[PDB]
Amino acid sequence: MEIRIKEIKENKLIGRKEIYFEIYHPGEPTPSRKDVKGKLVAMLDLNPETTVIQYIRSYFGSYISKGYAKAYDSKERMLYIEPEYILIRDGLIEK
Template identity: 50%
Template sequence: MKMEIEIEQRRENKLLGREEIYFRVRYDGSTPSRKKVKENLKNALGLKGFIILQYVKPVFGSREAKGYAKIYESEKKARQIESSYITKRNAGGGGKAEEKPKEMKEAKEGKNE
C-alpha cells in the first residue's frame, strides 16, 4: 500500500512538553491502520519520542485522511498528561481487545452452571 504524509502544521507546546502535528495522509485502497500511520509519521519526521496519535479521520469521497499527533519525550511524560485510554490505545498493547474474551468466557461459564 502506498502512503504519503504531508505535514500541515507543526508546533511546539513548551508548557506541556510536547510537539503537536497536524497532517494529511494520502493512500491507495482502504484507510491505513493507526499503527501504519504512526510508523510512517515516525519515519517521515525522523522522530525519537513517544507518539500519541489522537485521531485519523478519512475525508469523505477521497483517498486521504486528516490527522493529529502529539510527540512526547517519553511514554512516562505522556502518561502524566494524557488520559489513560489514550495512552493505552497508543502504547501498542490495546487493553480492551484483550479483556473482552476473558469477560465473555466467564459469562458463558456462569450460564452453563
C-alpha cells in the same frame, strides 16, 4: 499512502509537539494506526515510545485523511498528561 505534514506546533508548557498531517491514498483503505505511526516516526525521527496518534479521520468521497499526532519529550510526562484510553488505543499500555 503519502504523508504530508501540514503543521507542526511546539508546546512548551506541556513539553510536546503537535503534528497535523494528511494522508493521500486513492483506491486504498484507511491506513492503520501502526503503519501511520511507523511512517511518521521514520520521517520525523521521533521517539516511537513517546509519540501518540490522537485521531485519523476519513471524509466522505475523499482520498485524503486527516491525522493528528503528539510527540512528548519524556515518557513520564506523556503518561502524566495523556489519558489512559488514548494510550490503550495506540497500544502504549498493555491495559
